[PDB]
Design an enzyme around this catalytic site. Structure first.
Site, short mmCIF file in Angstrom:
data_model
loop_
_atom_site.label_atom_id
_atom_site.label_comp_id
_atom_site.label_asym_id
_atom_site.label_seq_id
_atom_site.Cartn_x
_atom_site.Cartn_y
_atom_site.Cartn_z
N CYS A 117 0.85 -1.18 0.00
CA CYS A 117 0.00 0.00 0.00
C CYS A 117 0.90 1.24 0.00
O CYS A 117 0.67 2.18 -0.76
CB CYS A 117 -0.97 0.00 1.18
SG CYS A 117 -0.04 -0.18 2.75
N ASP A 118 1.90 1.21 0.86
CA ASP A 118 2.83 2.31 0.97
C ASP A 118 4.21 1.87 0.47
O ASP A 118 5.11 1.62 1.27
CB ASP A 118 2.98 2.77 2.43
CG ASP A 118 3.40 4.23 2.61
OD1 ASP A 118 3.62 4.69 3.74
OD2 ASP A 118 3.49 4.91 1.52
#
Length: 148
Positions: A117-118
């Site tokens: 996600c990051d």
């Protein structure tokens, strides 16, 4: 991250290019939505690495599945495997990373969606060697002996 689909697909053949270094990689197949290789974690264990982009965060993702090659009769058979994290770590390398294993409605199929996600947070913004710095960064979860 802003790495689009056509931006990450531009280095698609770049990830596999280096992925070739993998000594576990026995098969090299590309797809129209990432890549599909056959990593041989064990003579009786196959890990189908499936790469796919996610417009959710505008970054690439990681999804693999454990397999269990059974040559009881010597037909070159196999069967999907399923174990906990601690057990899934016996081969993979999480350390401080994160993964999400979810089963299908039929509960006959499952996948190991690696936390991506990051990525820009870890990988960075370098859209130049992102597909490389990304994979080579997410490859440490599959092989800590292979540094592309």
């Amino acid at each position: 991250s802003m790495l689009t689909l056509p931006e990450y697909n531009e280095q698609i053949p770049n990830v596999r290019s280096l992925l070739t270094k993998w000594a576990k990689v026995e098969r090299i197949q590309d797809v129209q939505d990432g890549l599909q290789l056959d990593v041989r974690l064990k003579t009786d264990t196959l890990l189908e690495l499936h790469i796919y982009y996610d417009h959710v965060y505008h970054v690439p993702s990681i999804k693999f599945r454990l397999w269990s090659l059974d040559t009881e009769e010597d037909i070159s058979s196999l069967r999907l495997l399923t174990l906990s994290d601690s057990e899934l770590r016996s081969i993979l390398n999480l350390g401080t990373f994160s993964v999400t294993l979810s089963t299908d409605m039929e509960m006959k199929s499952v996948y190991y969606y690696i936390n991506n996600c990051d990525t820009d947070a870890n990988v960075g913004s370098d859209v130049e060697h992102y597909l490389t710095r990304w994979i080579s960064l997410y490859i440490r979860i599959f092989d800590l002996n292979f540094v592309p």
